Amino acid sequence: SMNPPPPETSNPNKPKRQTNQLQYLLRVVLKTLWKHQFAWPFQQPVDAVKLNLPDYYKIIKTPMDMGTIKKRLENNYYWNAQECIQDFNTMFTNCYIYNKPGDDIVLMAEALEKLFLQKINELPTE
Numbered sequence: 001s002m003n004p005p006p007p008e009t010s011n012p013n014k015p016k017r018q019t020n021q022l023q024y025l026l027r028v029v030l031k032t033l034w035k036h037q038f039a040w041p042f043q044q045p046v047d048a049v050k051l052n053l054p055d056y057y058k059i060i061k062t063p064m065d066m067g068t069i070k071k072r073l074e075n076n077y078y079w080n081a082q083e084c085i086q087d088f089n090t091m092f093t094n095c096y097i098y099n100k101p102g103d104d105i106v107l108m109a110e111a112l113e114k115l116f117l118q119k120i121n122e123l124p125t126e
């Protein structure tokens with residue numbers, strides 16, 4: 001099958017705002033995770049046709065990735081920081097759902113999630 005379209009990253013019908021948490025999520029959290037040595041499988045929607053995974057989008061019905069998260073932050077798609085944090089968590093749990101414990105790819109996601117959780121445990125007050 002064909003890849004599904006990526007998640008929505010822009011919406012003019014939503015209000016926009018900037019906070020000390022949302023800039024931190026893009027400037028500190030997204031950037032640090034992007035530059036991590038294990039980040040490359042998570043920097044764009046899973047290309048199920050390139051990777052020959054015809055089951056991925058039958059199994060993963062809420063896709064999410066760091067490329068989409070970066071765009072959502074850049075377009076002020078999120079009103080609250082929790083929305084962005086939820087998208088990161090959806091990304092990691094997608095990897096765990098599609099794979100099995102102890103797969104190499106899962107070890108990759110777990111390292112990124114550990115770093116993510118460390119950086120969220122230091123999120124600034126509004």
Ligand SMILES: Cc1cc(C)cc(Oc2nccc(-c3c(-c4ccc(I)cc4)ncn3[C@@H]3CCN(CCN)C3)n2)c1
Binds near residue numbers: 094103
């Ligand atoms: C370590 C590795 C190996 C290979 C062959 C390619 C690769 O590159 C890559 N790119 C993109 C996606 C994936 C991926 C994901 C995944 C799922 C949700 C999200 I959000 C992000 C990634 N789950 C599995 N895979 C790969 C497919 C086959 N699988 C092997 C069975 N465990 C490993 N891998 C990395």
